[PDB]
Design an enzyme around this catalytic site. Structure first.
Site, mmCIF file in Angstrom:
data_model
loop_
_atom_site.group_PDB
_atom_site.id
_atom_site.type_symbol
_atom_site.label_atom_id
_atom_site.label_comp_id
_atom_site.label_asym_id
_atom_site.label_seq_id
_atom_site.Cartn_x
_atom_site.Cartn_y
_atom_site.Cartn_z
ATOM 1 C CG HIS A 123 -5.349 -8.789 4.438
ATOM 2 N ND1 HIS A 123 -5.186 -10.116 4.790
ATOM 3 C CD2 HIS A 123 -5.737 -8.142 5.563
ATOM 4 C CE1 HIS A 123 -5.489 -10.272 6.068
ATOM 5 N NE2 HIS A 123 -5.821 -9.090 6.564
ATOM 6 C CD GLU A 138 -3.755 -12.573 2.393
ATOM 7 O OE1 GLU A 138 -3.797 -12.792 1.162
ATOM 8 O OE2 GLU A 138 -3.872 -11.416 2.877
ATOM 9 N N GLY A 184 -9.852 -6.648 12.663
ATOM 10 C CA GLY A 184 -8.881 -6.159 13.672
ATOM 11 C C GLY A 184 -7.984 -7.202 14.357
#
Ligand SMILES: *[C@@H](CC(=O)OCC)[C@H](C[C@@H]1CCNC1=O)NC(=O)[C@H](Cc1ccccc1)NC(=O)[C@H](COC(C)(C)C)NC(=O)OCc1ccccc1
Ligand SMILES: *[C@@H](CC(=O)OCC)[C@H](C[C@@H]1CCNC1=O)NC(=O)[C@H](Cc1ccccc1)NC(=O)[C@H](COC(C)(C)C)NC(=O)OCc1ccccc1
Lengths: 180, 180
Positions: free
Chosen positions: A40, A71, A145
């Site tokens: 992502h 991922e 984050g």
């Protein structure tokens, strides 16, 4: 006690802060010019790596033998410096442990080391609507984050932190055979 | 980057894990045989300090000039070894900073370093029903087992982590003049 010290040396020598058009991430360099980010993060042809623009030559989104999302993105950097080769420190398969450290390093969360406790082989997860495989689950991190954070025990790199919900965090297993 | 390194040296040399009848805490040794815990740790005449029983000779719950709670206990240990004197590293007054590290070290959360970001002089707080003064507030820690964590910037010890609610954390200001 030991996991912390292994973790600091690894981050010192192989981690960097990365900004994509999609946020700030921790990035781990693996060997040669190959580094790893969460899928992502979607790095474009240039990324800011430690405040400095760096070309990306290629970027491979990993999937398993049936095309299921893992991922992770492997990226090859357009830079002359090579990374210290840490393939030897990578887990060969999904690893479960009682205690692990999650190491995150960005301009927003610099030098963050989190003992995450038990790490289990969760396996399949619907992560952000996307069917994802080879997930490792642990309790107690879980903030925007922190993705790309590196999950480690003494002497091994287990995974890269990619998602979470509540007090649960999820890493993509970082497997030795992904590299080459 | 630097705050992390100062923080590791400080914890290495002056912190310990403490169990009281009331839980597990990080403890910071200050000078001589004097150490500090949150007031609510309520150490008895013996504590387990790094897995080892250690007598406590005296324990002073700090309050201000009007008897308001400061939420810290100074304890004098019945041990022959002296602490490295770090009074020189203590803040003289309440300190506000843009970036600070919270360092927590227990058997449950070993070697945990958290960048907490902006630290402000919150002042008065109703903490766990108790009117408390000289609080420093920061965003983003806030879990059972983290009290006693040491709040630091490069070259200064600002406070000791005592409470929180939601994404907010609170330290008692650790002031140089408390010691003597
Ligand atoms: C790290 C990246 C980031 O900050 O986003 C910028 C793009 C971030 C870390 C998690 C946020 C909350 N806790 C975390 O550790 N990762 C993400 O936001 C994931 C992004 C993503 C991954 C894979 C495919 C597509 C997108 N998304 C999630 O972690 C997602 C968060 O949802 C919210 C509503 C909590 C924000 N979590 C998720 O889908 O979990 C499903 C789940 C898992 C277990 C029990 C119940 C539900
Ligand atoms: C550390 C000690 C511990 O684990 O308890 C064992 C005795 C712990 C750390 C906080 C827990 C949640 N987040 C934290 O950082 N400290 C405490 O539990 C405090 C103990 C205490 C301190 C002072 C006087 C008396 C007791 N208590 C609190 O932090 C308290 C927690 O309440 C709950 C319901 C969230 C568990 N928080 C509090 O009273 O906050 C009031 C407040 C502050 C700001 C906005 C709204 C409300």
């Amino acid at each position: 006690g030991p996991a912390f010290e292994f973790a600091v040396a690894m981050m010192k020598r192989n981690s960097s802060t990365v900004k994509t058009e999609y946020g700030e991430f921790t990035m781990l360099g693996i060997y040669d010019r190959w580094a790893v980010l969460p899928r992502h993060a979607k790095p474009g042809p240039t990324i800011l790596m430690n405040d400095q623009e760096v070309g990306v030559l290629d970027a491979k989104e990993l999937v398993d033998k049936d095309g299921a999302n893992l991922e992770l993105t492997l990226l090859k950097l357009n830079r002359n410096e090579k990374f210290r080769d840490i393939r030897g420190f990578l887990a060969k398969e999904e690893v479960e442990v009682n205690e692990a450290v999650l190491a995150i390093n960005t301009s927003k969360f610099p030098n963050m080391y989190i003992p995450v406790g038990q790490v289990t082989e969760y396996g399949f997860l619907y992560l952000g609507g996307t069917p994802t495989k080879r997930m490792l689950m642990y309790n107690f991190p879980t903030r925007a984050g922190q993705c790309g954070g590196v999950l480690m025990s003494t002497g091994k790199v287990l995974g890269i932190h990619v998602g979470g919900n509540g007090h649960q965090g999820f890493s993509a297993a970082l497997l030795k055979h992904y590299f080459n």
